[PDB]
Design an enzyme around this catalytic site. Structure first.
Site, PDB file in Angstrom:
ATOM      1  N   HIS A 157      41.236  31.439  30.465  1.00  0.00           N
ATOM      2  CA  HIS A 157      42.567  32.249  30.165  1.00  0.00           C
ATOM      3  C   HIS A 157      42.278  33.547  30.449  1.00  0.00           C
ATOM      4  O   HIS A 157      43.167  34.417  30.365  1.00  0.00           O
ATOM      5  CB  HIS A 157      43.087  31.781  28.981  1.00  0.00           C
ATOM      6  CG  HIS A 157      42.320  31.752  27.765  1.00  0.00           C
ATOM      7  ND1 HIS A 157      41.831  30.568  27.476  1.00  0.00           N
ATOM      8  CD2 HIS A 157      42.107  32.652  26.904  1.00  0.00           C
ATOM      9  CE1 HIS A 157      40.979  30.895  26.168  1.00  0.00           C
ATOM     10  NE2 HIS A 157      41.218  32.187  25.885  1.00  0.00           N
ATOM     11  N   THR A 214      46.805  34.675  21.397  1.00  0.00           N
ATOM     12  CA  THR A 214      46.411  33.298  22.210  1.00  0.00           C
ATOM     13  C   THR A 214      45.999  32.311  20.937  1.00  0.00           C
ATOM     14  O   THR A 214      45.833  32.978  19.660  1.00  0.00           O
ATOM     15  CB  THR A 214      45.231  33.348  23.242  1.00  0.00           C
ATOM     16  OG1 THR A 214      44.138  33.625  22.371  1.00  0.00           O
ATOM     17  CG2 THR A 214      45.360  34.075  24.148  1.00  0.00           C
ATOM     18  N   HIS A 229      38.400  41.751  26.045  1.00  0.00           N
ATOM     19  CA  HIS A 229      38.751  41.324  27.095  1.00  0.00           C
ATOM     20  C   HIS A 229      40.288  41.953  27.666  1.00  0.00           C
ATOM     21  O   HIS A 229      40.298  42.816  27.179  1.00  0.00           O
ATOM     22  CB  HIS A 229      39.334  39.706  26.788  1.00  0.00           C
ATOM     23  CG  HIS A 229      40.515  39.667  25.626  1.00  0.00           C
ATOM     24  ND1 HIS A 229      39.828  39.758  24.353  1.00  0.00           N
ATOM     25  CD2 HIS A 229      41.678  39.691  25.762  1.00  0.00           C
ATOM     26  CE1 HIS A 229      40.945  39.684  23.556  1.00  0.00           C
ATOM     27  NE2 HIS A 229      42.254  39.757  24.365  1.00  0.00           N
TER      28      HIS A 229
END
Ligand SMILES: [Zn+2]
EC number: 4.2.1.1
Length: 257
Positions: free
Chosen positions: A61, A196, A91
């Site tokens: 992802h 997420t 990230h």
């Protein structure tokens, strides 16, 4: 399994993760006019001189650059925080086009990408326990706009070919995250969550006012990654961002006026 496609995207997450509809979900839109300047907010204290990066991994992802968090090597403190927070990974979220990609937005404006530096509160001993606490994590959000190249981001861009598909990782030592910071540390802060699944509401968000610039060629490289594992049909990793969630019973404070 969840993702960002038409059938498993953000609008479907609530079915497996009911907290997706909770009271302190992220990201949110930052309305610069209703954010309250809070004079009691202290300056941020970012200490990354002893940071030890270990590796980079494509998790299906996004790609995470992981750090050694067994000691107080790279820490964040001050600002609206109590205690010391250790950096565990960073990230990005990016778009298929330059006009979208960031999760947080400023006055409804979307940026080409968003960098997130994740830290956990040392009081809790490990990352797993920290995510279960209301003040367990502190995430630094930094916006990326397309302009001139960002020198410090290039080592990350060049290694992307070796982690093209889900599950692949590569040793990634001696990377200095200080090369990704804007010159000013002015920020907005609000209580929020992971963006997420499991979407836990354990994050104190610190979003920097000043974005960093990356080149079109640099962002282009992010768009070559794959959500899929090797040997499976190719799905380009683009638009891995969750839309803004309702603010509800929350106040966004600003460290600057
Ligand atoms: Zn993120």
């Amino acid at each position: 399994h969840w993702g960002y496609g038409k059938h498993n995207g953000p609008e479907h997450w609530h079915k497996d993760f009911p907290i997706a509809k909770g009271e302190r979900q992220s990201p949110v839109d930052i309305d610069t006019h209703t954010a309250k300047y809070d004079p009691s907010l202290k300056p941020l204290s970012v200490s990354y001189d002893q940071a030890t990066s270990l590796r980079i991994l494509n998790n299906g992802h996004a790609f995470n650059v992981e750090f050694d968090d067994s000691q107080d090597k790279a820490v964040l403190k001050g600002g609206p925080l109590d205690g010391t927070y250790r950096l565990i990974q960073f990230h990005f979220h990016w778009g298929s086009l330059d006009g979208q990609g960031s999760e947080h937005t400023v006055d409804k404006k979307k940026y080409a990408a968003e960098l997130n530096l994740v830290h956990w509160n040392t009081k809790y001993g490990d990352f797993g326990k920290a995510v279960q606490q209301p003040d367990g994590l502190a995430v630094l959000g930094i916006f990326l706009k397309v302009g001139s190249a960002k020198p410090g981001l290039q080592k990350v861009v060049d290694v992307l070919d070796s982690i093209k598909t889900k599950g692949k990782s590569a040793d990634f030592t001696n990377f200095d995250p200080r090369g990704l910071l804007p010159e000013s540390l002015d920020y907005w802060t609000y209580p929020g969550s992971l963006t997420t699944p499991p979407l836990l509401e354990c994050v104190t968000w610190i979003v920097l006012k000043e974005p960093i610039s990356v080149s079109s060629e640099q962002v282009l490289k992010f768009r070559k990654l794959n959500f899929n594992g090797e040997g499976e049909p190719e799905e380009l990793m683009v638009d891995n961002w969750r839309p803004a969630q309702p603010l509800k019973n929350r106040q966004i404070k600003a460290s600057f006026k």
